[model samples]
Target: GKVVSEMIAWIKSQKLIAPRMKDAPTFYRNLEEALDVRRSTQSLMTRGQSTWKTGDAIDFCSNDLLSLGLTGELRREFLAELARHPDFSLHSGGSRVMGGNYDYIEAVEQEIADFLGAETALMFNSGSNGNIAIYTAIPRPGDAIVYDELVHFSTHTGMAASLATTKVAFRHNDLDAFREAMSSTMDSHPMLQDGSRSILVSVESVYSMDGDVCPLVEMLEIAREICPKGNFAFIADEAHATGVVGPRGVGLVKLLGLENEVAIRLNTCGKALACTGSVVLGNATVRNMLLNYAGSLVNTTAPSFPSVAVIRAAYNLMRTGATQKAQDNIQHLVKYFFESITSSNIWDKATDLGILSIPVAEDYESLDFVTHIVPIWTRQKYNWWLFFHLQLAKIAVVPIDYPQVPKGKSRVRVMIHAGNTEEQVDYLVATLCDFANEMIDIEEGGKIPKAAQEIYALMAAH
Candidate 1:
């Protein structure tokens, strides 16, 4: 009776329709429209051999590229340490400025800075927060922000909130185009010529979506050639590449010997570190400036102590031979996967970077020469069908669609990681081959349903 009465109270409050609840229906309607277009996101509770249940199926959907998260020994060690620290609270309790700052957090920051060849480091709760804080704290009213077109959305959001006078996006990884854009900005903005204005070049070490690396060396050269020394800052987001690339797993900047040249580097712990939080690596002056002026850092609650402890432990493990091993394993797997698929009809001759992209037609058909002409109107239908089919086969790969990639560039993104076995990789390749063959045959036979054809025609016209 108590439970029923509590439920009734909850329902009554919901039915009261507060101001915040008034727009709830509009949000749901938009989501429904996106669902119809196969753009809505769905969350799943996945279980696996790992204690944390990263995923249930032969996992390819996760970004734990090094598989450090799955290391039983690491998990055991972390838990053991946690048990020993009986007084450590899971919550940070307050912002660092208020009361959350601690010796351990500073220690982790210093460790990260030393590992990445930076003079100093400051920790943030997450990569998004780190980016937002850096942009919001650094750029002045007379400064300009230039970034790659394909930079992560978080960087975009950060730049939007920055005090920069102008923001521009150059073509992704196109160094010459970036040079042109920078030159044009300088030409138009007279303050830039007088060294009173600054230009911040933003880029990622490795693009997450395409799994391609940025040409950091060339980009740095371009930036230096154009902007005066004191006025230029190169900010590289090393979220994907840290601990997965570079000597000693520092990141692309160190790998390319441009560590000192790049002004700021953001290394995220959630990716290869397989932990929570991120760190902004820069000079002592920059770190001090951020601490003083960054509103996100000053106002936000500090990262949990336990999370910082895990990061320190992960970095210690990374410094050992483990990081090199993961790098070699991923390189070998990426090469093998590419070679195996290149012989297949669906293979595109793209660079091998642990991500396998299999392009599909607009109607969701596999884009083989023979199947390209057919418009499979039920693309979303086939996408879900493929997902379920793979699930039944005890494998899991995700279909990325519009807005994730540009419209019509939709494809299945198969991410290879250290945890994935040779057998699992082989199975994935063979299954994709089977599916591709079947799709081609179906397209050739004009086997699409009448209703699907009508829907396709209507969508095309619209």
Candidate 2:
């Protein structure tokens, strides 16, 4: 309040003041109060632009699952694509429906769609943009959208802006809950029952937090069994699945051969591919529908030439079998990392001491698929300490804290990649054991350790 009054006086003193919004200073005072609430918690969302500087640190956090960009091969291939297309425009300069639609952009769009086993595709600025366009345009007033509760925040925002009569969320990957959600939705909207209108069942192919795969086959079966007229339009989000799941990284829907069943699919470029865009794959009708009706496409500048070039280069890397080795290496790392943790001394002590924990996924042995997006679950109060421990050790991992995650599920998300060696995993897990071990050993008595609290603050600052 003092600061705001001082600013108001300074504006008058400068003799350059204009008419104000009157309540503008009050808004900032309100905002400052809200910010202080977050500031005290030490979980402020930041880019770390002010103080973050990583010099040759090992990455276990980024979405670069294939490690193509980190290895510099993706950059080299991108130059080759640029050289191949000298006539390309560096910027699109206008919206797709305005002055930016061109043959070169359309070619890349078609190329990606064909590679991913879809009839047509439209490239958006990002996964969020693509989802926003889809949710805002596709679902009509009479239609329903039953989505997973844990789907990306973009889907939620888009669904909130949608015209769909009913938008319901079911438990993440809980097939029975999904069934109930659909049933509950259909009960209210009789059009969904008769096929006059439709329902959009939205799902994320791979959940980023828990790193679990959606049971697409089972979901399709449930939808088919419940809706005999086959009026359900499945919207599968491959945001975390592209370049990491399916045959040659075609994504999960294509992997399960459900290309015909799933209507619209979102293959995001930023996650596993090390690029920054999204390609929405569907039939020709859906393509044209998005083009005309999607306000994001209508109002914003279309994909530029360099963006298309980078996408092509990434795809070329996949098509030329350059990423096959990385894929295999990551899969191997997932299994080895899990095995290493289980066999460690900390494994038993982890449960007893409540310091660190790992998952066994019901049947520990004879596993079918493993998630590379691994999480190191920690004691809720001490999770930030583990985050600081890893950072001081120069291993990069992100802590999922309160408000983003639930109360007790706070963890450090460790992303295993192709570029990471087994030895690196060994060191990482060893560091984890050392931290937990020291916590157990250093404590002579009851109150929280001074060192642990200090380290926790260090993590909170970031």
What C-alpha lDDT values do all the predictions have?
0.69, 0.80
lDDT by residue (329-445, candidate 1, tens digit) is 776676566556666655432213212334321222231111101111124446644544454455655556656667655555556777777887788778766655555556557
Q: Show model 1 residue runs off by greater than 4 Å.
A: 1-56, 80-93, 228-230, 344-389, 448-462
Error of 1 at 140 (Å): 0.9
CA lDDT for candidate 1: 0.69
TM-score of each prediction: 0.78, 0.89
Clashing residue pairs in candidate 2, if any?
none
* lDDT measured at residue 71 in model 2 versus the true structure, 0 to 100: 83
lDDT of 2: 0.80
Among the numbered candidates, top TM-score falls to: 2
Q: Which digits, one per residue and each the tens of the lDDT, describe model 2 over residues 258-337?
A: 99889999998897788899999999888888888788779998888998888888988887778888888888898888
Model 1 worst lDDT window (10 residues): 367-376
